[PDB]
Symmetry: D2
Subunit: 335 residues, 4 copies
């Protein structure tokens, strides 16, 4: 039957979520709206990518410069700025992915109902919107909900990881630090930035300590962990891929070889597909294209003892998250 | 006596230009304006840099929410967006440096004048302003022209070179190409670029080529070389510095040495400090912080015959160019 | 049906391997390399950075010097001196000298001792006969056992020029190649007794490097001799390079006239060698483009019907690693 | 009292200790010897430095072949591929800075004595030699110990830190996660690295998780903290300056304010020159050329609870360290 959704904002996640859509069985992209991208550009954008190569799984021919015959199936293209104006219904979009980045408030992201959107999943943290992390609290969802936050490229990594170690060894207190690549919010040269004074520096030639909320966020998905965790971040000159680094003082004495078998049996378990397991000398690039939320590098980690350890978990901020986007609509539609 | 000027736009060129003035003893920066860099976020800027080392020539402290105080010599800051609405006259801007990559049109830049600024010098080739290149036509200036443009990071490099070869050889044609560094005009990751598609791709991950009017933009500074030139560019992952690839064909059959001797004996006194000469297995970074408008790589360059050669000229697009501003303005005030 | 062997398992060496395994033309049987173990190989060949991970078909170790690329096994050597690799004892007829230390007709002929019929050097050779694909693979008889497939750059600039030359005739020109860093560039300001510049930071500078790929053109295309030559700039990128060829032609022709001349050339007689693309693409846009040259329509600029700048791309690694296999396909059909 | 030094590893770390010596009003560089780099080539690498700026202090000319001539003072050159025959004293050098990183074994670096060498500082941990981290345990050097090791770019950071913290609050335990800038031990493109597989991956375009006993090393200069520390590393794409993401668990419940004032107070005290204290919104590069062994980033760190905090202190590996090297000599002699 396929869940008809509307991608609003054609950014990175914005089309990666697209790319992951037009290549499925249970979902179908029928319209995208980003006023800053003409259709004649919207194709080119979608077609070519520095990180995920050339499309070619359907052909791309513009039908009537406002459509976009995405090889057989059609996909309406809009340039409506205000979310209350975009006419989703008329085109046909039950669910609307929120990949524009400037409407995280449950309201500014709710303006999508008007147009006609039935359900709208905010593809970014939310100051007041139900945060659902696949494999952790996406279970705790109810129909009546119409506005959900799919957490952050990170969180979907830290949470599954935390739910693993915790359900097994209970996290006492723990600091996390993630070596993130650079996104569309960093300059290329020291420029102006009223929010992240530091992030307003050349992103390709420095290390920048951009603060996070991901862990203070895990307090949402996992309640018990609320307060036990926090952390930060380090932006770096890498294009894609990123990596968590949770250091926790578990409350159930166990060795590293035991915590590793844990994630593993958890990666082959219910969490199979969300949290991955890997025991091989790898490097950022080798995860470019990983459809998993969190990858566990059992060799990168280190343990000082059975009560204090440091765990490293890889994760494609772009690809993995973009899968977490559709995968949720897949859940919000089976409910 | 000590020309007082102000910069509109504290971008890379702003702070950098200031660094040339607040350093210089024949010019005195008096007022600045960047509607995006509130005073606070200004000190942290003007001081710490990622390409030209930290600032250590005069203490940087804020006297109040409306006036900095570099090296115990106050300077003012406005949060004004619209040019004209900036009280340039109040500080004492006998001159104003328009560096925002936007307001680069006679009328646009002509705004300032309203606030007071007796003169405005655009820092980017203008459509209706008379561009000049210190070391070529900076005499075609007159005290009757208020708005003027100061060539571009490149024009200031090709100009003086094509100058010395036309002044000593005979330019029939000759194409250019520039392996030019990034800029705050490009995106970090594949991003929408309204007018410059190629430019909307990952900055420090691609060999993004692009056109450069500077080519036959030098057909204005040196009216003699009309059409006799033209070229393009290649933006490569480099924070600063850039090089010129001039494949010129000449008439007066000359040997690569009869050139070096010229380009040197032309840097030894005619365009000394406005053009340099080096014969060393150098690289881009070696040129960081070079006030010369255009360095010549007496080695990297090649010759097919005494009539068809390739010449290479290194330049710190950022730093160097700047000194052309506070030299042009310096000169501009003498006439 | 054509068995081969590679000495030195570098990028080209591995990618030239990735070809023979996914091809139905050539088959990989030998792999000599003293600096990497059988156990280490099954990792330097698997997960890659520029060309991604190799999931195409399962890999597995059998028992040292033995390796399973799916179900087809490959002998793995560690001998250091070429003349001591028993190629003949594994089945490798053609020994691909993709190591970059043996480029002398004499030196790389050490395989010929190991019982290998012919050796294909994967780079310029001061004396061994050079043949660039699409240019003059015809100038090769079944009697030369020490050949060369020119360079990552010459395999690109070669066609592009010939195509222009045949149609509009070349009088004199020059070239530049904003090329990507390679195995012979230090990670940080280090030594290099031959290329000082080439020593400094690899991805933090723009290293100007000597290059006679244009000078080499002269050898694979007689009438173009002495009328070419250029330089190169080693900028901060992992792969793909570009050819900046500013040149004069005898038959004054509009830029479009070249475009179609070019475009029509890359549509029949040279299809799979040269390419023609008219879109705003970049470096990463060409990772894996098995072509030798790839003209960029909207890229180069013309100064008039008698002095234009033709620019073309070419994945130094893949485009080349592919042409090596293509020059073994030719020698295999003479 | 001029301490005559001798270098045996002219590399990123070798040239620097030379620069530091030529400016050290009390040290004397009299012999360099990285066999591969010659008297001609040597000048180049010493003069130009892609990172730490071009050398402008001295003048440096070449008096004959076998010897340089840095500003009036001659320095005997060496191209001896083996330590058992480098005539250190024959040229005059009580101390021999071992900067090859291929002779870290006491007996392997003792091949210097057999040439007329007295003390020999190995700028790299030794499996057997003694470790000293200036500001920490430089107390335990005894006139007799001829061969000594100088911790590491990394340890020479985590020690000043872990100390100023343990002294003031006592570390219960803790993990370190450093982000180092690629070095010569890497390859530019996926190449062989049999002793560190990951390492040989594209150094300029990846996130390679390395290992470093730097944290387990402090248990050698800090006897108490033995087995209380540990940690691995991440080599993101940069050139210089790094960070110590230290996660600890302190004894005396002390608020973050206090941990800042603890580092600071002692940063100006008995550790002046070793620890630093930045309370600004800085980034990577700003730390370039900072001789401190470990600058504390007051604003980067974050605390979960008054016992489990995360302190972050930057250190310019290459340069910062280099000094400590000399410093140990200024100390190894004065006793």
């Amino acid at each position: 039957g396929k869940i008809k959704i509307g991608i609003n904002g054609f950014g990175r996640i914005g089309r990666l979520v697209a790319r992951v859509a037009l290549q499925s069985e249970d979902v179908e992209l029928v319209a995208v709206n980003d006023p800053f991208i003409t259709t004649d550009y919207m194709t080119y954008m979608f077609k070519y990518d520095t990180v995920h190569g050339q499309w070619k799984h359907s052909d791309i021919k513009i039908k009537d410069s406002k459509t976009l015959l995405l090889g057989e199936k059609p996909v309406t293209v809009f340039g409506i700025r205000n979310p209350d104006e975009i006419p989703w219904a008329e085109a046909g979009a039950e669910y609307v992915v929120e990949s524009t980045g400037v409407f995280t408030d449950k309201e500014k992201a709710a303006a999508h109902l008007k147009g006609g959107a039935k359900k709208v999943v905010i593809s970014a943290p939310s100051k007041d919107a139900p945060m659902f992390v696949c494999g952790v609290n996406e279970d705790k969802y109810t129909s009546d909900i119409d506005i959900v936050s799919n957490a952050s490229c990170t969180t979907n990594c830290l949470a599954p990881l935390a739910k693993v170690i915790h359900d097994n060894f209970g996290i006492i207190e723990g600091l996390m630090t993630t070596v993130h690549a650079i996104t569309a919010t960093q300059k290329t040269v020291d420029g102006p930035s009223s929010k992240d004074w530091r992030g307003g520096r050349a992103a390709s030639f420095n290390i920048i300590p951009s603060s996070t909320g991901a862990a203070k966020a895990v307090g949402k998905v996992l309640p018990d962990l609320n307060g036990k965790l926090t952390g930060m971040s380090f932006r770096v000159p890498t294009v894609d891929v990123s990596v968590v680094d949770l250091t926790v003082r578990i409350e159930k004495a166990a060795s590293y070889d035991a915590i590793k078998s844990a994630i593993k049996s958890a990666s082959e378990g219910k969490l199979k597909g969300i949290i991955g397991y890997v025991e091989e000398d790898l490097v950022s690039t080798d995860f470019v294209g990983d459809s998993r939320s969190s990858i566990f590098d059992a060799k990168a980690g280190i343990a000082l003892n059975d009560n204090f350890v440091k765990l490293v978990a890889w994760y494609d901020n772009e690809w993995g998250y973009s899968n977490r986007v559709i995968d949720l609509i897949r859940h919000m539609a089976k409910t």
